[PDB]
Design a binder for this molecule. Structure first.
Ligand SMILES: Nc1ncnc2c1ncn2CCOCP(=O)(O)OP(=O)(O)OP(=O)(O)O
Ligand SMILES: Nc1ncnc2c1ncn2CCOCP(=O)(O)OP(=O)(O)OP(=O)(O)O
Ligand SMILES: Nc1ncnc2c1ncn2CCOCP(=O)(O)OP(=O)(O)OP(=O)(O)O
Ligand SMILES: [Ca+2]
Ligand SMILES: [Ca+2]
Ligand SMILES: [Ca+2]
Ligand SMILES: [Ca+2]
Ligand SMILES: [Ca+2]
Ligand SMILES: [Ca+2]
Ligand SMILES: [Yb+3]
Ligand SMILES: [Yb+3]
Ligand SMILES: [Yb+3]
Lengths: 143, 470, 484, 143, 503, 143
């Protein structure tokens, strides 16, 4: 888990005009977002209030290191997803195409139309390259 | 360039009857079955109903001498013969099997049945030689082209004994006279029965259909009947019931469907007359992440029922690619591949398409008053983007990349940058270059960067670029 | 009848210096106690006799049994008996380096000098041969050969220092290669002078007569037990008195882990050989082998001197076991075997087996809660309470006020009780594959134990007729009558 | 050792309708008894009062792990005893018989009568098998 | 007089590229500083010269000195010089695997291609021979031989890639066996392209002239210290500059542990070879070996270039020691030897011995109160820790005679207060203080045998105290004068008799 | 390190008529002096007052172990000095002579007179042997 904590450490010190190592909740979000997350303003409160009883609004590492020590529990499936991505990508080109998305689907029962299919690709597609790369496949599976 | 049928089965090591019996399951369940090599000198023992070693026994089998086919306690009598570290690591494993599993596993003298000696004579492993009498006891020498040990067998009980040759020394630097050859055994109904190599499965690739069949008709419906997530509702019903694996002790890490697939394989063999229980005791090599074995020849049985034997790792990769991972079949490769396996520090490489097209970019730092550090610059993949049109995106995208092109990036002469970072950003730049031409060619980077001057808040140059769409 | 060597022939194989052995008969006899030694480097014997000092626990390098440095402790452990065994050599050297540093001025190394007589001794034993002469830097040398293939040895004519180098194209085990250089040997500091070391006498085991142990117990501390109305708390203090003065052992500073009587016996031994003339100091330097739990050595031939004064040499481990069984551990003599036996020695992962009667019985003896728990601990390497409790009920000292007839009954029941609270756990869920076996095991044991108590007086047969359903002093009523 | 603490851990969680891991002194005894001990009610107080200054009567592991870290000091002679057992058992049958108990005794000076001897066996004997097994030999040397 | 090679012959054995060595004379001379290099893979030399890049600290795989891959860094370390050494091979590979992963994109591996000229080079050196042709899947190959018995090598005619396989029935050290497959070699990333690596120039030690070190000291700071009264604090001032500017060293990011002047000298060296045409980059990548404390390498032949510009090659370690002694550490030049020497290097447990004067004289020197209290600690590793007071079994006794006095009396011997007395005085007061301690010690041994090794520690101190005293005495006029002295009644009185005794 | 703490432990228990392990500041100095140090009475106060807020004047190990854990920071140069000593000693006799002290000096710029030189030697010399041994060279560098 060295790298784990090591990762949370990298971003934490990336933005912190505090110096010693204490940020605010006005940026706590940006941190979790730059570190690959999309938390809702509702979740950024009920947590920064349970462990942070300081009432000062000051946050450091040991505190943050613990919050992440909870969220990263039933989501660390990074693996399973990455593997699934590879399952769609039959041609092994590194990207998921509509044709490919078709098979997986049809072979799972749901017979889709060339329309519906192309709809899913575009929806999941973020760069407009007309295909889904792992990074995209990831975002699409995150929420 | 792979062997087929008879010839391949010959090299697979599986007991013919068992393999034939396997075609049935491969076919019926439309799923590829891949086995790792099987000690050829173990085959016959297996067929004759000898029990196979499970995860509670890690000693390596032997492929020479009278004890060939079994699991010698003295691992220098195993296939690892002559490899000090392997022998030693092997023994410790046996010692452990003997102690941490008392009454479960044990060792017993090796007895070579009248028929076995014969089998060995054909295979040209040992030869029953001249007689010998030692304390009023009758023995018959058993030879082998080996130079360190000397073997003999008792006429009375048929126990085999061995000793080190004259002046010769064991790998571990030992030397001893005549003494029994002990072999790993498991407890069966209070009696200790000898063990032999099992059928270590390499991988299992089921017809994508099959994993569906696995899903409960209900949980599936609650997302397939236009509940459009769906797009991601499928993948997850694909993961939990097709990709997901978990520990299990008797068997190792594996998957529900795999577990089942196990049972059928086993049952499937009993029918041929196999007495000694199971031949497939645990999950596939693809989940053997701590001590991965990289074998040269893989034995594959396709859903057709044919027999194929890859000749070498590079080949096994192709086969899997062309006929499985690229043909609607469920497959995942050992997570240790392309990494240093923790256990034995193995470094087995495998083709990861994801790393294939790795000329892209995201949260790096994966690499590890007055707004200058803040701002939305490292978020190329802006989720909120399905609102734009495929054209806007590819158009805006390039912009975001270039945004990062000259971000805080041109900091190429901040104090003293190590060739390590530059290399990265460089590479990254080499990525952003290609991660654009594509968006372009779809519908027409070293095109026009002179028509770009970022010397102000990205918002100011935003209009610029949109005018550069020409 | 066992096949063991005797007298002269055995002494020959023991490695001890004859005079020393003879001298030992005296102590074995006088103190009525078996003395067992582990093999002794035969090429060390003469050196010992000539008064060379032996290695104590502050020196763990292994002696050599070949080449000019034979009999001594080469600094370069690839010149020792462990020659050619990379790991052993390496482990050997680290040990020497440690001896040299963690004990500065205490232990050191010095060039090996082969005295005029020693070369001769070696020639006879057929270890090395003084060969052709050689001159190298205006210096005179005489090659010394050996059937060895990696090294080449020569000796200086002036000071008689031996040097060695690796042969052409040949490589050391550790993957080294070098030319001419002195052969250093482990030495100890004696009166400011550094004197070379050699193999010592390692005691395999000391088996004294129970009586001899008695002499260790203080005359009124024993009476304060012997003379005690009670019987239970007596049999205890009598045992605890055996332990304290006979069994228990402790880690001494330099004598390793040995007991107190052993400490004495040790001194008598060193005394004995000094009366014969040994001027090197001690020949026995520490506790014995049965306490060498971290790195146990399993030797084939053990040299035994019985309280009679005779010499016996077991031929092989299995035999050494018999001897000890038939003539010691089964004939009123104090003896305890290495606690590592039947386990994986921590230090060298050795796995030496030995016959342990207690285990033998395990099959017919129900377990205590502790064992039952501790079996659930060491079964956690990869869940219900009435069982361990009941087992605690089976073994209740309260039973010392009842009659055997009573005991068996109450016990027989308590067993059947546990056999139930267990049977239903398996009737419950498989839980863990190996936990299932643990219970199929307990079951059998509980079975045997009970079935055993019963044939002592009158299992499943009487198991179909018993209650499960409503729990107090009632289900026990039917039983009472059932057994009659 | 690892197993040591591992053992104290097994029993501790064996009975604890608390959940998280906190038992009472109303059962603390049962625990130490199921784990192979016979402490007196007098000793179960002067200890649960020195370290437990909470005044709540709640006990957990780290606390218990320390108490045991004291008692198991001049009693860990498990070895010495087990060895002693083996010393009495001349026939190596795994059990201590009267005849055997005789020798050890007579050879240590105390000459006993066939009566007194059979008395000791019967006293130490707990199952009535007419012999002492290690387990029994243990209780007789501890309890 | 020492048996060391010189010039041409020595350079030949050094392994450095001639041009590079010549180029080095320049710096050695100009900066009046000895330069010492550890051996360099001879089969690496030519590769270096031809501009191949050398391996830095991010690559610990060992180079190869045989077979087609000779001179390079084979990924399969059994193809390196460590060939046939299971543990070394294994340790070697793990290192490569690490280099490949913990440094992605930085370091990598690539197929070994033997250029038309290289094969030739190899043929001369008699390393490999281009043999018979072979055709395998419609592909043309040419066997490459070597007197090796485990592997078999061949080269592709098309791309010139070399492949190897294990011989029939033969087994790898690691117990492997495989058919034809490419020989991968460690490489570094250069401008997006992966270029092969080779042995670098490892500096054994850099010995500069004290003066050259002076130039390192800021002329002002040298003044704020050379300009002051205190005659004694006069030296202590320069001593600390000498240190700060030439002795102290620090762990750099990629240059390992080196000093600052060394950092400079380093750059001059790489500069020098670039002036000759070396286009591979740096040829020297790290502090010197004397700071390589975790895994010290003890080489036989050291290549030295003296401030004169001459070439010397020590024949063996013992010799290298002499050379350094007679011409460097004994001739006004800055030098410090690996701190691991005479100790067990932590990393590889190496035990390289070196002559350390301080020790070579701690026999006639009295221990410090500290250089004593510390010993009592180490010697306390052969016993159990508890209470220093009351260590006896009897309750009537609770203290080892002269518990602390022995220490204090040692602290008295080394008292800076003595800087106001005369030598004649000093020796006297000291000679006594020693005899004082020799007493508070003698009675400890006269008291009980406390611990077997503690006894020796004192039989040792005794001798030392003895020698020291006896030494001070022969400076002017031991046991002889020990029978006539007091024990019995303790202030400024027992010291009175002594005064007269020495005269 | 182990030895470090091990050293501070040796002296600490050397003088302590307290028993359990608690000395006074009336001797704290003697300890640090016997352990190779020369602290000033001004420094023996501002420290024994920061960590020691007991107001009792009682000191133990854990406390002392921490004080040393600070002083031994920019002084642990023991190494550098020892090396420097070896630099002066050209003849490798184990002692520093005037002649030697001369060179080092003159080669560093400061040209000294046979008088001034012999002055430094005597000053640094503590035994009067007419030369400086490492031990002395040490005191002179850390008084
Ligand atoms: N799913 C899994 N979990 C854990 N370990 C596994 C798994 N699958 C495979 N392994 C590891 C080792 O499999 C048994 P092992 O006995 O080492 O095979 P083998 O090497 O083929 O035996 P052999 O030596 O008898 O020929
Ligand atoms: N009581 C003990 N305490 C510690 N170590 C012991 C004890 N008893 C035995 N040993 C271990 C090793 O005894 C010394 P060791 O030098 O290893 O003997 P050896 O191997 O017989 O010597 P040799 O190599 O000189 O032939
Ligand atoms: N100052 C230093 N600090 C740290 N490590 C050092 C220092 N000086 C040397 N080293 C450590 C390793 O040096 C490089 P390495 O490449 O392993 O040498 P080598 O074994 O001679 O190379 P070769 O295998 O390429 O022939
Ligand atoms: Ca695709
Ligand atoms: Ca895309
Ligand atoms: Ca018995
Ligand atoms: Ca009984
Ligand atoms: Ca000098
Ligand atoms: Ca002096
Ligand atoms: Yb297996
Ligand atoms: Yb010994
Ligand atoms: Yb290097």
């Amino acid at each position: 888990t060295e790298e784990q904590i090591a990762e949370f450490k990298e971003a934490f010190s990336l933005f912190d005009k505090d110096g010693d190592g204490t940020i605010t909740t006005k940026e706590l979000g940006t941190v979790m977002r730059s570190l690959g997350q999309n938390p809702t303003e509702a979740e950024l409160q009920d947590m920064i209030n349970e462990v942070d009883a300081d009432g000062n609004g000051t946050i450091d590492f040991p505190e943050f290191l613990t919050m992440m020590a909870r969220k990263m529990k039933d989501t660390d499936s990074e693996e399973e997803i990455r593997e699934a991505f590879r399952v769609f990508d039959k041609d092994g080109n590194g990207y998921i195409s509509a044709a490919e998305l078709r098979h997986v689907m049809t072979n799972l029962g749901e017979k889709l139309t060339d329309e519906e299919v192309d709809e899913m690709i575009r929806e999941a597609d973020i760069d407009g390259d007309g295909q889904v790369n792992y990074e995209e496949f990831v975002q699409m599976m995150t929420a | 360039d792979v062997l087929k049928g008879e010839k391949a089965l010959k090299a697979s090591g599986l007991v013919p009857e068992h393999a034939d019996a396997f075609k049935k399951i491969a076919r019926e369940l439309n799923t590829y079955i891949l086995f790792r090599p099987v000690n050829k000198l173990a085959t016959n023992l297996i067929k004759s109903g000898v029990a196979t070693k499970g995860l509670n026994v890690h000693g390596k089998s032997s492929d020479w001498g009278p004890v060939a086919g079994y699991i010698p306690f003295d691992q220098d009598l195993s296939k690892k013969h002559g490899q000090q570290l392997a022998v030693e690591k092997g023994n410790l494993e046996n010692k452990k099997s003997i102690t941490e599993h008392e009454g479960e596993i044990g060792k017993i003298p090796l007895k070579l049945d009248h028929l076995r000696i014969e089998e060995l004579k054909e295979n040209g492993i040992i030869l029953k030689g001249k007689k010998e009498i030692d304390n009023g006891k009758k023995y018959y020498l058993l030879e082998s082209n080996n130079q360190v040990y000397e073997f003999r067998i008792s006429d009375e009980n048929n126990e085999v004994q061995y000793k080190t040759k004259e002046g010769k020394i064991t790998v571990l630097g030992e030397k001893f006279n005549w003494r029994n050859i002990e072999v790993m055994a498991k407890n069966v109904e209070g009696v200790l029965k000898p063990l032999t190599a099992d059928y270590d499965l390499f991988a299992l690739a089921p017809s994508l259909t099959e994993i569906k069949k696995q899903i409960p008709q209900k949980e599936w419906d609650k997302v397939v009947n236009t509940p459009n997530e769906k797009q991601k509702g499928v993948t997850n019903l694909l993961i939990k019931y097709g990709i997901e694996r978990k520990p299990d002790s008797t068997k190792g890490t594996l998957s529900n469907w795999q577990k089942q697939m196990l049972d059928r394989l086993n049952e499937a063999v009993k029918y041929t007359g196999y007495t000694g229980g199971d031949v497939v005791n645990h999950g596939t090599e693809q989940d053997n992440e701590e001590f991965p074995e990289k074998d040269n020849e893989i034995f594959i049985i396709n859903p057709e029922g044919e027999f194929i034997l890859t000749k070498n790792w590079e080949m096994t990769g192709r086969f899997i690619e062309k006929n499985i991972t690229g043909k609607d079949y469920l497959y995942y490769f050992n997570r240790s591949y392309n990494k240093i396996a923790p256990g034995n520090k193995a470094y087995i490489e495998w083709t990861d398409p994801i790393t294939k097209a790795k000329i892209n970019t995201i949260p790096t730092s994966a690499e590890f008053s007055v707004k200058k550090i803040a701002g939305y610059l490292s978020d190329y993949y802006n989720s909120a983007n399905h609102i734009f049109s495929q054209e806007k995106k590819r158009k805006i995208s390039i912009f975001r990349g270039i945004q990062a092109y000259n971000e805080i990036e041109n900091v190429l002469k901040s104090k003293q940058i190590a060739p390590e970072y530059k290399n990265y950003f460089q590479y990254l730049k080499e990525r952003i270059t290609n991660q654009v031409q594509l968006l372009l060619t779809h519908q027409k980077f070293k095109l026009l960067y002179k028509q770009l001057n970022f010397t102000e808040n990205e918002t100011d140059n935003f209009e610029v670029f949109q005018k550069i769409i020409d």
